[PDB]
From a paper:
Two highly similar crystal structures of the A/bat/Peru/10 HA ectodomain were independently determined to 2.15 and 2.24 Å resolution (Cα r.m.s.d. of 0.25 Å and 0.34 Å between equivalent monomers and trimers). The overall H18 HA trimer is similar to other HA structures with a membrane-distal globular head comprising the RBS and the vestigial esterase domain, and a membrane-proximal stem region containing the putative monobasic HA1/HA2 cleavage site and fusion peptide. The H18 HA ectodomain was expressed in the HA0 form. In contrast, H18 HA has a dramatic alteration of the binding site residues where only three (Trp153, His183, and Tyr195) of the key RBS residues in influenza A viruses are conserved, although Glu190 and Gly225 represent consensus sequences in avian HAs. Significantly, Leu194 in influenza A and B viruses, another critical residue for sialic acid binding, is replaced by Tyr194 in H18. Together with other larger residues, including Asp136, Gln155, and Asp228, which are unique to H18 and H17 HA bat proteins, the addition of Tyr194 dramatically flattens and widens the RBS as compared to pandemic 2009 H1 and other HAs. The glycerol side chain of a canonical sialic acid would clash with Tyr194 and Asp228. In addition, Asp136, which is not found in H1–H16, would electrostatically repulse the sialic acid carboxylate. H18 HA exhibited no specific binding to a custom sialoside microarray (data not shown) or the glycan microarray of the Consortium for Functional Glycomics (CFG) that contains 610 diverse glycans found on mammalian cells, including over 100 unique sialosides (α2-3, α2-6,, α2-8, and mixed linkages). The lack of binding to sialosides was further confirmed in a plate-based ELISA with glycans 3′-SLNLN and 6′-SLNLN showing no detectable binding to either sialoside, in contrast to H5 HA. These data strongly suggest that bat H18 HA does not recognize sialic acid receptors, and its receptor remains to be defined.
Residue numbers in the entry:
A (entry chain A), B (entry chain B): 4 to 325, 334 to 505
C (entry chain C): 4 to 326, 332 to 505
């Protein structure tokens, strides 16, 4: 008896997937949508180099700690890379005001250029470019921040200065305010019990009255110099009126703001010669997969952070391999050139044949599904600027629970997406196999006995042309009716 | 030979949809769930008018800048509409404290009424209602904020005032503190080198010591008047003790808070004669669709912001139109009065007929699906109050990434929702058509030949009563068995 | 004529569910994924007891208001339970600085121990342990915070103190700064118009200059004592230099930080003898269900807050039962008579009739639905939930940011949970239909033309089919050829009759 069977592809794969309904289902192929790779690399971001602060803190670098390299040429950077514990920080003790807000402005810049803003020689009856042993060039020297000019010996005299930004870029300036320890120290340094400074930027007034007060000794100092900064926009002016206790913004930085705030990547590692679309402090996430379980904080074009161990989409078929029987009893290791197909038996021989059209149709559909799940993750620029000052822990906690909130959303949704889609993909394969089965069944009608195992017992001699017609949907029922009827009669007696 | 076919509706639609499996699939009908219309209108919000500040800033209007229209009668508003750069702002230079917090309180109010709080005539040996050329009615005048009474010539004398809020609404009061330029100016205005004010609201004490300091000249002023505000709750008291340098809250506003914070809409446009459930600064989003791609910031009962270009749900069938064949080969342009139905062929004639019951059932199901996807988007009141002071850029950044976070959540989920639901809607239609096919098939049994094209070749004369019985599920197989068997015999040999 | 039918379970259930396509569909069984119970209970959190402040505020308890119970032994707590309006708060009027940040540190602690930090007798020519009628032990008395030592009569003299934390846990210290009303009061208390204090913790300097200023009368006081706090880490030092107007941190608390910030639960209720994985101020949420509509704010291992009134997953079948007498199959509805499974058979032959469940198909579907329900629940594996969402009174804009963050997540979870249920219910019902149809097809392909498909889910068998024959069909071992002849002959009678 000639036979034609419907069946599907099996293989040697050990891969499994989970669905909403079933766990650890063996499948012929699958595809991960979760980026998990740790490489520990620090790279350029979208072809743009980071600023390597070496062993200096950002304030130390900005203010020009003598132990920190000077910015000689116009530069740019995608993010800032800083050591977790810089050797060279603020050398003369004092607070650096609003560092977090400053980071927002300079984390990603397109032009960045140091320029002399003030001719310090224009002031009379004072000393300039003063130095201190707390800020040495190297072992035992005495120097100071390059950009910040410590003026002394005011003797209560008022210095007046005005500046106009006639360039096309905003100007970043940083200055210092000297808090002396006692009246004696105040006299030694300035020769008067006065020393207040008002610095005005645009319409904004900043006034620093003389403060004399003892503090604990840090780096050989019971006194402090507190640091502040401001931005002078194109065509804006700034002015200074000082009677003492002031560290002048002799040098400043012209810079061009960017739209995408990155932040500071804190790492001991050095910058490698590599490029990534997404960067973290423990490595690059150089991947367009929609999810990652590598790190909560990152910068650039990044997958969503989730806590999943894996997210594997089924793509292939249930891997349940079995005259040969058909799809009802399992898959065919022997069907090697497609997903769904046929096996035939007649006088001329036997063999497997793939349904190329049905296979390709399903391939396009599953590929479209996976690509949709991946490509629809079109994200906002990811930032790592998530710091607040030390008296703002409540805000940092809000920042933390915001990220916890999104973490729980993406984790749950990604996890359920995978389980649901895997269930459907497997049903989709079954529906496709059943369709080939039905297409054969309705062609043969009562010219065949449905064996119930995915195969048909044909009630007439069916040569290779006949087999091809069934597989091609061009089988003529009437052409074989008579022969089929005669064979059926014999069956109806035996 | 009599025939009955199962088929479905095609039409002239050019609409396409995307599914998880396929792209740009032609369908007979579809429905957008994404609001995209730009109208540029500023409207009432749920029948409630906004406050139009004209060309004044909110502080200028509240304090009663002479160039700003006075609130003459009690009012209310759903939101505040302010020019992006108001012509009339703070006339006497100084800072307005905590504007952002104030906006939370007065952006959406149910009552707002000005009332005189202090009889300024009760104070002796001072001058009141002082004016200044920086706050003119117009060119060359000298006037002042209507609500704020500038007291001078204290000569260090202590003024004492107490007030009890015996109304049921909170009372908003705004005051000013004069920072003079130098001792001489302090003398000219107050006749004493003293001038401190303590203002107490409920259990809260605010002390404003005398500050004398030069600032840069703004509008002819090197001195400053800085503005502060407070809220005196129902049955709370406030009191003032002042020796000078004080601008008194002669007038204040009783106001009724609402639960739903809206905010300030910044636009040059005027308030039009329209009404919307959701408003943005570039136009109304007067729509109950679950998503919108119009603007990140909005107020009211609003769809979620997404970055999608379109979100179109399939509602109708694949629009793939094809003696006539049935559903296997495509849809019927000839089936005009339903989604699924039949075509029959007999001696009495031929024609199309819709399955009304199957069509209505599917219509109800799809209507339910679309309405669920829309109506389940039942949202919290949307606010545009997302401002922080200029020294809080880190918090504004937190606010920005929060919205970036939700934008990415809603965009990805809406996009995938549409793709998944479109796939299922198309399969739903296939399943319904297949059901009608099976229902005909199992009635006819071997009284007909399944032609494999969605049509049946009936082996007996099947009149309109017979055709109706098949479509109605009341066909009697046994009634036509004998006649059918005879035709089959001719077939099993012929 | 012998018959075999394929059908499914019905019962007396009145439960309904909603799907994307249909509303209020009666089903034989279902399962809620929404925790809705209000119990008003305050419990231990994961076996860890809360700190009950009784009728005291957290600052009053920390500083040792005499009317508040003293911490006598080392302790621990999962969260802090405070009355909404404590009777005993700050007795000497003044502001308590940065309470919100402090809460982040002490809301959940593993060791917490009061210890004397400063020997106050080391200071000469001053008075210590000063008291005030605003902080009494009882009626008409005068006392003071136990932990805070009010030093007076400095007479401008500088006191100096240095301390090193030589223990293994951080040290919380709390101090006070006296703002006097006027020069006369300043003189009465300190005998000098000076009184500034500098307190240094590690490298962090805090200076509190003398402020003399009148305020309104609160609890009989026009003056103020303002409170501040700091944390001295293991091996860190702190120091104090004061010339007056200072209330000293004589006692402090050693404590061990935890990773999971809980917060303050505000309630009038007392602590019950119960245990919960998630707690709110209106009751325990002792449930691993993925969603809850009980309260926006909670602590612990908690379901996500949603605004849904209900989220009921279908588990069982459409409960649409069919109206001796011929019985139809699945096409016309379910079987009240099928009691031992979800899907199964009904047969009729010469030996009798009866219902029988398909055990294998029932078990397979039960495992599948159980897996589905458990996935929807167990994948909700959440970050520790916190209720610390407070900011100072001059920070309403940040509180508003916090509020809209929560509104934002509320809208996400509500919409997604609601649609998850509608989608999954639609699919669960289709899943049952597909399983029933599979049994139908398996019988059909076995019988072939040895039977007439009646179209109601039943087959009229064209030969005598006894109990062995019926068992074979149900077991998939029916032999078509064994009955072909008899079936064909019976078909002949039909093709003429
Ligand atoms: C940024 O700062 C600059 C520099 O000015 C400051 O310089 C500091 C060093 C400090 O001393 C500070 O006090 C200075 O203001 C601002 O530009 C200045 O603006 C002022 C007006 O505010 C101009 O003053 C004018 O000076 C004219 C005389 O000198 C000019 O012309 C001379 C030839 O005769 C020439 O030799 C000289 O070098 C100058 O070029 C004088 O004629 C003017 O008198 C008229 O003033 C008004 C006219 O309407 C009227 O009231 C009066 O009766 C007279 O008719 C006037 O006093 C300065 O010239 C000008 N300095 C420079 C170098 O340009 C700048 O102000 C902004 O730009 C200017 C050009 C104006 O448009 C301003 O309105 C504008 O705000 C500051 N920029 C900002 C953003 O604040
Ligand atoms: C808001 O302020 C009002 C107004 O009073 C303030 O007025 C300012 C101008 C300023 O000077 C401020 O210091 C004032 O307190 C508060 O109401 C006042 O409350 C005080 C007590 O806090 C009452 O004082 C009493 O006065 C009684 C005499 O007045 C009554 O009789 C007269 C009839 O002609 C007339 O003078 C007046 O209209 C009253 O009808 C006097 O008998 C009392 O003596 C005994 O009282 C207590 C024992 O209870 C004891 O301390 C005292 O030694 C005596 O034994 C007492 O001195 C004021 O009468 C009262 N003023 C008015 C007009 O009501 C208000 O306080 C709040 O309301 C009152 C009614 C009380 O319940 C308070 O407990 C409560 O806090 C302030 N509101 C708030 C929330 O603070
Ligand atoms: C799925 O897995 C099975 C293996 O588990 C695999 O079938 C195996 O294929 C290999 C060859 O790829 C066969 O290996 C042979 O084993 C015989 C003994 O049984 C050896 O004698 C053979 O050795 C000769 O040939 C080798 C090269 O073919 C030479 O390297 C060697 O020197 C000898 O000349 C040979 O190794 C193995 O027998 C089969 N096993 C079975 C049961 O078929 C199957 O191919 C996998 N499926 C796919 C698609 O990969
Ligand atoms: C932290 O405090 C310790 C303890 O010493 C201190 O004790 C109190 C009671 C008071 O008398 C202080 O004046 C006294 O310093 C310091 O340890 C001391 O170090 C200094 C030298 O810097 C020395 O004078 C003491 O003898 C040391 N005492 C001992 C035996 O610990 C800390 O000093 C720092 O830490 C030490 C480990 C040591 O390496 C020292 O060099 C270092 O500076 C104090 N820390 C600071 C910076 O204040
Ligand atoms: C700043 O970051 C954004 C990330 O949103 C970048 O915008 C994306 O750019 C590419 C093409 O320019 C697209 O794939 C995305 O659709 C864009 N997203 C959006 C929201 O427009 C942007 O290019 C970045 N800017 C720079 C200079 O890197
Ligand atoms: C404040 O805004 C909220 C939006 O959340 C409005 O509440 C909705 O209003 C109607 C009935 O008032 C309901 O259909 C929605 O379900 C409500 N949502 C909630 C959470 O209650 C509310 O109407 C607004 N308040 C006013 C008076 O305008
Ligand atoms: C702090 O809270 C977290 C909440 O995530 C707890 O971490 C969970 O621990 C339990 C078992 O203790 C696991 O079932 C979860 O998988 C953990 N969640 C995650 C995402 O880590 C943690 O145990 C808590 N710590 C303490 C001391 O109770
Ligand atoms: C990141 O991806 C790009 C594009 O695939 C590739 O050229 C580059 O080598 C990748 N970098 C790393 C770290 O592999
Ligand atoms: C807003 O919608 C309502 C109800 O659909 C409608 O009546 C009204 O015309 C709309 N307003 C605008 C701005 O068109
Ligand atoms: C139509 O169908 C119903 C049920 O299938 C049947 O009861 C009714 O008699 C039919 N209508 C006619 C006119 O026969
Ligand atoms: C349901 O229906 C009737 C109502 O009383 C009852 O007699 C019958 O036993 C019930 N069925 C079951 C399963 O209990
Ligand atoms: C909380 O759940 C646990 C575990 O199921 C149980 O032992 C305990 O009784 C529950 N507590 C409450 C509040 O009922
Ligand atoms: C195979 O069968 C067909 C159908 O009858 C016949 O026409 C044809 O000759 C046969 N082909 C060959 C090559 O034997
Ligand atoms: C059509 O044919 C059927 C079957 O013979 C018969 O019962 C019925 O009367 C006929 N209908 C009409 C309209 O005559
Ligand atoms: C029932 O019928 C079968 C079918 O031939 C027969 O073999 C068997 O003996 C009968 N069963 C019994 C035990 O009566
Ligand atoms: C995260 C967002 O992505 C892109 C930028 O153009 C936007 O300004 C924003 O930074
Ligand atoms: C956004 C939310 O919607 C509604 C209000 O009743 C809530 O308080 C909140 O404003
Ligand atoms: C809420 C989060 O859940 C858990 C902890 O390990 C994290 O630090 C955080 O507390």
């Amino acid at each position: 008896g000639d036979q034609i069977c419907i069946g599907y592809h099996s293989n040697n794969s050990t891969q499994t997937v989970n669905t909403l309904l079933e766990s650890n289902v063996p499948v012929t192929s699958s595809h991960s949508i979760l980026e998990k790779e740790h490489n520990g690399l620090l790279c350029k971001l979208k072809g743009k180099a980071p600023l390597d602060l070496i062993d200096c803190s950002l304030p130390a670098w900005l203010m020009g700690n003598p132990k920190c390299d000077e910015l000689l040429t116009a530069s740019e950077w995608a993010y800032i890379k800083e050591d977790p514990e810089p050797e060279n920080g603020i050398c003369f003790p004092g607070d650096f005001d609003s560092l977090e807000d400053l980071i927002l402005l300079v984390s990603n810049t397109d032009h960045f250029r140091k320029e002399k803003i003030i001719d310090m020689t224009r002031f009379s009856d004072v000393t300039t470019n003063n130095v201190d042993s707390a800020c040495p060039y190297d072992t035992n020297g005495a120097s100071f921040y390059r950009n910040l000019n410590w003026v002394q010996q005011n003797k209560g005299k008022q210095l007046i200065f005005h500046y106009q930004n006639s360039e096309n870029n905003p100007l970043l300036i940083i200055w210092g305010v000297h808090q002396t320890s006692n009246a004696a120290e105040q006299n030694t340094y300035y020769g008067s019990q006065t020393g207040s400074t008002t610095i005005t930027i645009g319409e904004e007034t900043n006034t620093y009255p003389l403060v004399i007060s003892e503090s604990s000794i840090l780096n050989g100092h019971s006194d402090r110099i507190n640091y502040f900064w401001g931005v002078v926009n194109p065509n804006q002016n700034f002015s200074i009126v000082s009677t003492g206790n002031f560290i002048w913004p002799e040098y400043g930085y012209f810079f061009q703001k960017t739209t995408n705030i990155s932040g500071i990547i804190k790492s001991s590692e050095k910058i490698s010669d590599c490029d990534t679309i997404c960067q973290t402090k423990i490595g690059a996430i150089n991947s367009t997969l929609p999810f990652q379980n590598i790190h909560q904080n990152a910068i650039g074009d990044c997958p969503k952070y989730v806590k999943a161990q894996e997210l594997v989409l089924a793509t292939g078929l249930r891997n349940n391999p079995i005259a040969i029987a058909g799809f009802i009893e399992g898959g065919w290791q022997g069907l090697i050139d497609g997903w769904y197909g046929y096996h035939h038996q007649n006088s001329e021989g036997s063999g497997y044949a793939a349904d190329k059209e049905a296979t390709q149709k399903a391939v396009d559909a599953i590929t479209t599904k996976v690509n949709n799940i991946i490509d629809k993750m079109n994200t906002q620029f990811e930032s790592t600027a998530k710091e607040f000052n030390k008296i703002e822990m409540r805000i940092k906690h809000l920042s933390d629970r915001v990220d916890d909130g999104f973490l729980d959303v993406w984790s749950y949704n990604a996890e359920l997406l995978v389980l649901l889609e895997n269930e459907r993909t497997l049903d989709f394969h079954d529906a496709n196999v059943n369709n080939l089965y039905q297409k054969v069944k309705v062609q043969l009608k009562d010219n065949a006995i449905d064996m119930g195992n995915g195969c048909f017992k044909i009630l007439h001699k069916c040569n290779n042309t006949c087999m091809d017609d069934i597989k091609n949907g061009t089988y003529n029922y009437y052409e074989y009716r008579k022969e089929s009827h005669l064979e059926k009669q014999k069956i109806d007696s035996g």
